[PDB]
Amino acid sequence: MNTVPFTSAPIEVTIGIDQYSFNVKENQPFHGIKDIPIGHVHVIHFQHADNSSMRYGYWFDCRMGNFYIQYDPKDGLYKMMEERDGAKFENIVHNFKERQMMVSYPKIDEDDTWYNLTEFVQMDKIRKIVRKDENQFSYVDSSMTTVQENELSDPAHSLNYTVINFKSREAIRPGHEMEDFLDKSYYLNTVMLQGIFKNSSNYFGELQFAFLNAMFFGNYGSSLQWHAMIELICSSATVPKHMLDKLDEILYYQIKTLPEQYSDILLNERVWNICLYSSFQKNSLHNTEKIMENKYPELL
Amino acid sequence: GAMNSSNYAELFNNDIKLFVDDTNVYRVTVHKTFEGNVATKAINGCIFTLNPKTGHLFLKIIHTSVWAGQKRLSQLAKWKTAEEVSALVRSLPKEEQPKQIIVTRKAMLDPLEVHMLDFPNIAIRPTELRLPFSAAMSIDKLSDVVMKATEPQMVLFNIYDDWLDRISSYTAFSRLTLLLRALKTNEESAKMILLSDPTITIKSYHLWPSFTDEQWITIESQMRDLILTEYGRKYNV
Ligand SMILES: C[C@H](Oc1ccccc1)C(=O)NN
């Protein structure tokens, strides 16, 4: 189990770690988060008490370095940094643990939620969507726009998700116009899976990461990407049976984890109704359809 | 965006544009089978592609053979339309290709958009106008060439005859839409109006009779009377 220490908490802030969150008061004696489960990526995220504008945070994997959080009063946010001196870091953490100045990552033993939300997400792929190669961790916030968004303005601060566009030459073989527009299997299996993602694990990893950035930061370009990747599978007549079964699981845990009071904005009525009721895979998402109908019957 | 009353004079500016109407592409007669079920029998159809400024109508005849062994024909009809329009554009010299294509029904948008991906600079637009182009098959010479076709065929017609020698495109289009609206609302009366006078003939190379300017005014008046009449007969006013 690993630790992200905090130098201090000089401004009042709600801190998130994965699906957990807690309130820290201005200059409260808080020095970080311990007992963080090894084996998964994580995200530690922030919303200032004073300006709920800009949720921001950092994706990281404790196996890739020792990371801490330090408030920057000039740029006005909590910044993640890597400590290269290993013995310095251990001694800092040990002192904060001895003084019980750290919150414990509060995982219930029965609880596989975070695994199920990040099963296919890998730090190496995150770092290719969020390009900032001098750091082992990746910053994301509410306002960052995606490559596709910028095509329709700062490139270095973009989310480089794979562009999906159903009315594009990439998606539509010359001479197969109707066939490929009404059944997207070509685009799913040959262009995206075989060509771009190489395998369905990488496809699912980007889909999960998009969802997580949508949920945790309200990042609108990410929500667009999550729905696009779902629709591309649902609108393909020919999908590997194992991909469909796993998609149902992935979506099931995403819908389960979404805050109930955010469903109005984070969920696209057209995509879900089409996916669950009109598409080729309308009968292939039993768990997801059951939870959607019992938890958000209004949307449908 | 959408073409409507507010921007109606854009049709007659100097940017090339085509109206595309798919109403008459897939035509059927519905009938009873020996077993008392219901079956359709397709008949030949046409795509109505009109340049509104010049009157040039590219009438692509759709021969019933194109439907053989196909399913979901109403949906195929839209993609077929889009394929044939895209082929037409590609066949035109660059300086003759349209800058905009306006579809009379919104369900042509995605099919045409997808077939014209190769032409990103051609705008595909809907319209809020309820244009009467379905009535093109009430024009006897167009109906006849559609029904006689034994194979796919493109027939080339000027739908304004020689009217542009004497009137503007705006007036020519307004006459045409009034004639077609009349034929659509009461084809029998409309045709009686156009032919009542045996002395006014249709030239071999034309579609409509050779009316003088004065006679066109009488004709136009009679067609408006018809459209109000039927509007009363239909609504009891
Ligand atoms: C020759 C003249 O012009 C065209 C007419 C329609 C489309 C293209 C050309 C015509 O009325 N031929 N019948």
Side-chain angles (χ1 to χ4, degrees), chain B residues 56-58 156-158:
Chain B
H56 283 173
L57 166 63
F58 303 78
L156 294 179
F157 282 95
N158 184 314

PDB file of all heavy atoms in Angstrom, chain B residues 56-58 156-158, ligand 1:
ATOM      1  N   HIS B  56     -32.804  23.464 -65.825  1.00  0.00           N
ATOM      2  CA  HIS B  56     -32.218  22.160 -66.199  1.00  0.00           C
ATOM      3  C   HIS B  56     -32.696  21.100 -65.208  1.00  0.00           C
ATOM      4  O   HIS B  56     -32.352  21.236 -64.038  1.00  0.00           O
ATOM      5  CB  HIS B  56     -30.699  22.249 -66.178  1.00  0.00           C
ATOM      6  CG  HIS B  56     -30.135  22.946 -67.362  1.00  0.00           C
ATOM      7  ND1 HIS B  56     -28.806  23.256 -67.471  1.00  0.00           N
ATOM      8  CD2 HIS B  56     -30.717  23.354 -68.507  1.00  0.00           C
ATOM      9  CE1 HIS B  56     -28.590  23.836 -68.633  1.00  0.00           C
ATOM     10  NE2 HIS B  56     -29.741  23.904 -69.287  1.00  0.00           N
ATOM     11  N   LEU B  57     -33.487  20.120 -65.645  1.00  0.00           N
ATOM     12  CA  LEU B  57     -33.948  18.976 -64.832  1.00  0.00           C
ATOM     13  C   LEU B  57     -33.182  17.735 -65.299  1.00  0.00           C
ATOM     14  O   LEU B  57     -33.346  17.386 -66.448  1.00  0.00           O
ATOM     15  CB  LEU B  57     -35.449  18.811 -65.065  1.00  0.00           C
ATOM     16  CG  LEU B  57     -36.062  17.496 -64.590  1.00  0.00           C
ATOM     17  CD1 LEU B  57     -35.938  17.341 -63.084  1.00  0.00           C
ATOM     18  CD2 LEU B  57     -37.514  17.400 -65.012  1.00  0.00           C
ATOM     19  N   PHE B  58     -32.319  17.154 -64.470  1.00  0.00           N
ATOM     20  CA  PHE B  58     -31.611  15.884 -64.765  1.00  0.00           C
ATOM     21  C   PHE B  58     -32.559  14.802 -64.257  1.00  0.00           C
ATOM     22  O   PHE B  58     -32.596  14.582 -63.051  1.00  0.00           O
ATOM     23  CB  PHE B  58     -30.233  15.806 -64.096  1.00  0.00           C
ATOM     24  CG  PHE B  58     -29.292  16.919 -64.450  1.00  0.00           C
ATOM     25  CD1 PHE B  58     -29.430  18.156 -63.872  1.00  0.00           C
ATOM     26  CD2 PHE B  58     -28.278  16.734 -65.352  1.00  0.00           C
ATOM     27  CE1 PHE B  58     -28.557  19.183 -64.172  1.00  0.00           C
ATOM     28  CE2 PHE B  58     -27.418  17.764 -65.676  1.00  0.00           C
ATOM     29  CZ  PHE B  58     -27.560  18.991 -65.087  1.00  0.00           C
ATOM     30  N   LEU B 156     -32.669  14.416 -70.139  1.00  0.00           N
ATOM     31  CA  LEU B 156     -32.284  15.825 -69.885  1.00  0.00           C
ATOM     32  C   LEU B 156     -33.384  16.763 -70.386  1.00  0.00           C
ATOM     33  O   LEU B 156     -33.597  16.780 -71.612  1.00  0.00           O
ATOM     34  CB  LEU B 156     -30.970  16.102 -70.607  1.00  0.00           C
ATOM     35  CG  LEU B 156     -29.777  15.322 -70.068  1.00  0.00           C
ATOM     36  CD1 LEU B 156     -28.523  15.630 -70.848  1.00  0.00           C
ATOM     37  CD2 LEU B 156     -29.584  15.606 -68.590  1.00  0.00           C
ATOM     38  N   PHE B 157     -34.050  17.511 -69.501  1.00  0.00           N
ATOM     39  CA  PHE B 157     -35.163  18.402 -69.908  1.00  0.00           C
ATOM     40  C   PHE B 157     -34.957  19.810 -69.375  1.00  0.00           C
ATOM     41  O   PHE B 157     -34.288  19.972 -68.382  1.00  0.00           O
ATOM     42  CB  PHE B 157     -36.493  17.975 -69.292  1.00  0.00           C
ATOM     43  CG  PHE B 157     -37.171  16.807 -69.949  1.00  0.00           C
ATOM     44  CD1 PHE B 157     -36.990  15.521 -69.475  1.00  0.00           C
ATOM     45  CD2 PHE B 157     -38.030  17.000 -71.017  1.00  0.00           C
ATOM     46  CE1 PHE B 157     -37.614  14.450 -70.099  1.00  0.00           C
ATOM     47  CE2 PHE B 157     -38.672  15.931 -71.619  1.00  0.00           C
ATOM     48  CZ  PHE B 157     -38.472  14.662 -71.143  1.00  0.00           C
ATOM     49  N   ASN B 158     -35.442  20.813 -70.082  1.00  0.00           N
ATOM     50  CA  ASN B 158     -35.482  22.160 -69.484  1.00  0.00           C
ATOM     51  C   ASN B 158     -36.926  22.246 -68.994  1.00  0.00           C
ATOM     52  O   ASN B 158     -37.821  22.352 -69.831  1.00  0.00           O
ATOM     53  CB  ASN B 158     -35.059  23.316 -70.377  1.00  0.00           C
ATOM     54  CG  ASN B 158     -35.065  24.590 -69.567  1.00  0.00           C
ATOM     55  OD1 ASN B 158     -36.011  24.842 -68.848  1.00  0.00           O
ATOM     56  ND2 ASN B 158     -33.981  25.338 -69.598  1.00  0.00           N
TER      57      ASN B 158
HETATM   58  C1  LIG C   1     -29.666  20.854 -74.047  1.00  0.00           C
HETATM   59  C2  LIG C   1     -30.547  21.386 -72.912  1.00  0.00           C
HETATM   60  O1  LIG C   1     -29.879  21.463 -71.621  1.00  0.00           O
HETATM   61  C3  LIG C   1     -29.920  20.537 -70.608  1.00  0.00           C
HETATM   62  C4  LIG C   1     -31.090  20.199 -70.017  1.00  0.00           C
HETATM   63  C5  LIG C   1     -31.030  19.496 -68.845  1.00  0.00           C
HETATM   64  C6  LIG C   1     -29.837  19.104 -68.287  1.00  0.00           C
HETATM   65  C7  LIG C   1     -28.703  19.408 -68.922  1.00  0.00           C
HETATM   66  C8  LIG C   1     -28.735  20.133 -70.096  1.00  0.00           C
HETATM   67  C9  LIG C   1     -31.872  20.617 -72.937  1.00  0.00           C
HETATM   68  O2  LIG C   1     -32.911  21.083 -72.557  1.00  0.00           O
HETATM   69  N1  LIG C   1     -31.859  19.386 -73.496  1.00  0.00           N
HETATM   70  N2  LIG C   1     -33.022  18.658 -73.593  1.00  0.00           N
END
